[PDB]
Amino acid sequence: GVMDVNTALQEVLKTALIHDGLARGIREAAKALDKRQAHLCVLASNCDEPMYVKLVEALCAEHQINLIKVDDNKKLGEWVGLCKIDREGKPRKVVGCSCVVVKDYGKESQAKDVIEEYFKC
Amino acid sequence: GHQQLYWSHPRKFGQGSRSCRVCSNRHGLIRKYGLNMCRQCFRQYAKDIGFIKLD
């Protein structure tokens, strides 16, 4: 069926969830960016700290990778579950990263083509 | 650096880790035919080993 980038964002976040990943914090962010094992990026609406967003832009410039900026990405990333073992402690996230490979080895999808067509522009 | 330092000294002559094969017990280990038990477990479990009393 016809399935767009907005719906494909759920798919890419789910694929990231299956391989855990989803690097958080500030430290150890550009490990996969140097050797290009990650071929997809996600950004949230607006920003809270200019330092982080300008660092992310400068890093994308250092790696020649184009970002994707969407609206209400937080709910689409929360639908996949970020519990971190049961209701003990709370999650917190700002920028969604589908690090290390886009698609599963045994589970492909047509969303990859449209996501990358809107990702390489 | 304990990951590469773990188990540094080979304790081969001692039977702290080569004690009675049943439980955490020592003080009376016998190696006749390689039993590796104390007297307690051997005597209570000698019926299954095959050692009988007709002497």
């Binding site: - | 016998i30 035919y33 007297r39 005597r43 000698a46 050692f51």
Partner: protein, 101 residues
């Protein structure tokens, strides 16, 4: 050479002799020249253990003795025939070592 040697060892003399009689009859069921069962000296294993778990009372010991009885049957035949005779529901506790030379 086709001299197949069964080194058969067990804890019970009667079970051992029943195994030997059945094997030598199965050889006697076929046309196979055989030798009589050769009885190597039984191994008597002694373990003298103090009885009281903590040293107290009169010095009392148990003497557990292990009698291991071993026969050999060397017959002039290919080992396949002996294996054909083998599938006879061998008695438990009787172990067979196969020697081919």
């Amino acid at each position: 050479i086709h001299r197949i040697r069964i080194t058969l060892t067990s804890r019970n003399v009667k079970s051992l002799e029943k195994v030997c009689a059945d094997l030598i009859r199965g050889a006697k069921e076929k046309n196979l020249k055989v030798k009589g069962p050769v009885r190597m000296p039984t191994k008597t294993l002694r373990i003298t253990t103090r009885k009281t778990p903590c040293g107290e009372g009169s010095k009392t010991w148990d003497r557990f003795q292990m009698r291991i009885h071993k026969r050999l049957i060397d017959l002039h035949s290919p080992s396949e025939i002996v294996k054909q005779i083998t599938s006879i529901s061998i008695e438990p506790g009787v172990e067979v070592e196969v020697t081919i030379a």
